Amino acid sequence: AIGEFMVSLPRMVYPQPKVLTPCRKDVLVVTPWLAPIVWEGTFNIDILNEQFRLQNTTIGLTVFAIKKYVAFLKLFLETAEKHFMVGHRVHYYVFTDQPAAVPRVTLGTGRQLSVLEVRAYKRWQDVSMRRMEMISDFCERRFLSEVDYLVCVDVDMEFRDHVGVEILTPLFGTLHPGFYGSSREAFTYERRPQSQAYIPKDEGDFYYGGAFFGGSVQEVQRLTRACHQAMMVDQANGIEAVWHDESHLNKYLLRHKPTKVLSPEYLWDQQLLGWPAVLRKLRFTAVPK
Amino acid sequence: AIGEFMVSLPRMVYPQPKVLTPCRKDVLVVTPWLAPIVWEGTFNIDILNEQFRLQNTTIGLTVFAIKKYVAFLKLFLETAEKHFMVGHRVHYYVFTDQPAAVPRVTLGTGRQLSVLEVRAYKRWQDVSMRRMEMISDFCERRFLSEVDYLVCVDVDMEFRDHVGVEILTPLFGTLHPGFYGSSREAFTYERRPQSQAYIPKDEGDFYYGGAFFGGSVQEVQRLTRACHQAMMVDQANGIEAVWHDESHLNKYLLRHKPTKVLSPEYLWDQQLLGWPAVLRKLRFTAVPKNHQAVRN
Ligand SMILES: O=Cc1ccc(-c2cn([C@@H]3O[C@H](COP(=O)(O)OP(=O)(O)O)[C@@H](O)[C@H]3O)c(=O)[nH]c2=O)s1
Ligand SMILES: O=Cc1ccc(-c2cn([C@@H]3O[C@H](COP(=O)(O)OP(=O)(O)O)[C@@H](O)[C@H]3O)c(=O)[nH]c2=O)s1
Ligand SMILES: CCCCCCCCO[C@@H]1O[C@H](CO)[C@H](O)[C@H](O)[C@H]1O[C@@H]1O[C@@H](C)[C@@H](O)[C@@H](O)[C@@H]1O
Ligand SMILES: CCCCCCCCO[C@@H]1O[C@H](CO)[C@H](O)[C@H](O)[C@H]1O[C@@H]1O[C@@H](C)[C@@H](O)[C@@H](O)[C@@H]1O
Ligand SMILES: [Mn+2]
Ligand SMILES: [Mn+2]
């Protein structure tokens, strides 16, 4: 459950935080709306694990494996078992057009997987964009009565390192790995005013990646419904956003500030971008395709 | 109100946050449990003002002026009018044993003041400590119906710069000006194991000041009730914590991590501690108080 009040921790021994000697001096670790930006060195996972375990937190993880992308499921799930919310309750939701093709993956205690049979759209853009509709529909159908938080990710990925409760919050987005160091005028936001995803050159905080977002079930339901509705308006008006669901995701988080922002540790492509000094860990990374 | 969901902001024009060039590199701006530590340069007040105005946020501000401390009210309130939550709904709660001694202070629109007549304890230590009980009591009687957030401060103080919605969060404490740079072994926590407020030398994140804490009414009710109950246990055990209510506040916040921590910008004594480079603003500062002293 998501507790309405602070929880009481037991005695713990850990290094004292030092007010005058911050660990991370190379990156911004808080947004101008005072949401943490999550990098290695900014959190003590022991304290956070205690806080969330004490609430018996259940985390849902949605992933779409439509048509040939079912091939990505084995590695995705096997590596999630090693790295994703270990110690906590996890409910995987696998959206697929081929239930029989979902690999048999052995799960740790307290972890379960549900297979959701869905339509396969012809255009890859529609497969990607319709995720918003399908998530929003299932936020109502299932997630609201089943999980506390939802984490929505791409399937063509693997976990290489810890992805834990440090990300959980009412609403989070993730810094796109290609653009975290870019100026806002360079962001590939939708720039046509005719699109609902329109963002002018003088607005924008970050470029968030469509491959990793989440939050409380109610905030994710609102986000996904909003994005789908905006995409349908665009479709009626004969327009498709330059980067599809990601463009609408970016318009949504511009107007509704996320309560945490994940660093590109959480969404990386080592093949395309290497391993910069600013990344101490590569947590969730692209698989070649 | 406290909105259940994220609010939708209008178009705004402001400088882009730079991921690779943080403004404050001289201080910790986030705790190990991912709570912001609030310093100048860490927040855009226009964005936060929009977020909170859209929820029609009402902030309560509690202040005790018992016995001679009524002398501090005029300056406290007059400076609060200039610096505290300007633009937002504010409700001042003045707890006092002398209702008639509360000065007339002209208030801006959307701002109001209530005088809460309470008992005056003989010992100054009890006057200070019983604030917890009194705050908790009135949370049930008044605050839950009247405000969204409660801010609880010492009266022997004045505002000198902005104190606004950047501080608002479910539960917050403030870095004590004397110890923000100290190691935990030098923190003046209660060190007696027999005290409910006991914290050993290998525990502790920060030393928070008893003069400035707050949060949602519900969290403040819980904190003040817990601190009062702890003090009553100590009393029954013939124990009084070394720094009274502040010792129990520190025990409580050690075990229930605050969702924001305020920098000593928000609790300072310039006469005693000067003006270190790390403080770009002095927002809420000590006023001389030796003349209002009353011998037990
Ligand atoms: O051959 C072109 C394709 C582009 C996307 C395709 C696709 C994507 N997806 C899902 O949408 C997500 C986004 O597509 P993508 O990973 O290929 O997009 P990018 O991360 O490369 O921008 C995938 O991770 C899957 O979850 C599918 O399940 N089946 C698919 O056939 S197929
Ligand atoms: O002569 C010794 C005294 C110590 C505290 C006294 C006192 C405090 N108070 C309140 O307790 C708060 C804390 O006491 P303090 O400011 O004097 O002490 P510090 O906590 O700053 O060390 C004050 O700000 C007032 O709100 C009173 O209302 N009346 C008082 O007579 S009197
Ligand atoms: C230095 C100048 C900017 C250089 C930027 C280089 C990475 C570009 O990235 C693409 O960015 C698009 C938005 O503009 C979409 O997010 C697309 O899905 C993404 O590629 C996806 O994510 C990438 C990380 C790769 O994994 C690619 O294979 C994916 O298709
Ligand atoms: C390692 C060197 C540490 C050096 C610390 C120097 C400041 C000490 O401060 C006192 O600290 C106490 C706890 O230990 C209480 O909070 C007390 O109320 C406070 O004095 C109050 O606040 C002060 C700022 C002054 O305004 C003083 O007049 C007040 O009575
Ligand atoms: Mn992908
Ligand atoms: Mn004081």
Residue numbers in the entry:
A (entry chain B): 58 to 346
B (entry chain A): 58 to 353
From the paper:
The solved ternary structure shows well defined density for both HAA and 1 including the 5-substituent at the uracil base. Importantly, the entire active site loop in both chain A and B of the asymmetric unit as well as the C terminus of chain A are well resolved in the AAGlyB-1-HAA structure and in a conformation that has not previously been observed. Moreover, the C terminus of chain A has adopted an ordered state up until residue 353, which is folded over the donor binding site in a conformation alternative to that observed with the natural substrate. When comparing the AAGlyB-UDP-HAA complex with the AAGlyB-1-HAA complex, it can be seen that the C terminus in the latter structure fails to form the short α-helix, and neither His-348 nor Arg-352 interacts with the acceptor or the donor analogue. In this alternative conformation the main chain of Val-351 now forms two hydrogen bonds to the formylthienyl substituent of 1, and Asn-353 is forming hydrogen bonds to the backbone of residue Trp-181 as well as the side chain of Gln-182 in the internal loop. These additional molecular interactions provide, for the first time, a structural explanation for the tight binding of 1 to AAGlyB. The structure of the AAGlyB-1-HAA complex with a complete flexible loop and C terminus reveals, for the first time, a new, “pseudo-closed” conformation for this enzyme. Our results suggest that this pseudo-closed conformation allows the transfer of the sugar, albeit at a slower rate than the native, closed conformation, and could therefore be the reason for the small, residual turnover observed for AAGlyB toward 1.
One important example is the biosynthesis of human ABO blood group antigens, which is the most important blood group system in transfusion and transplantation. GTA catalyzes the transfer of GalNAc from UDP-GalNAc to the H antigen acceptor (HAA) (α-l-Fuc-(1→2)-β-d-Gal-O-R, where R is glycolipid or glycoprotein) to form the A antigen, whereas GTB catalyzes the transfer of Gal from UDP-Gal to the HAA to form the B antigen. Among these is the enzyme AAGlyB, a dual-specificity GT, which can bind and utilize either UDP-Gal or UDP-GalNAc with equal efficiency.
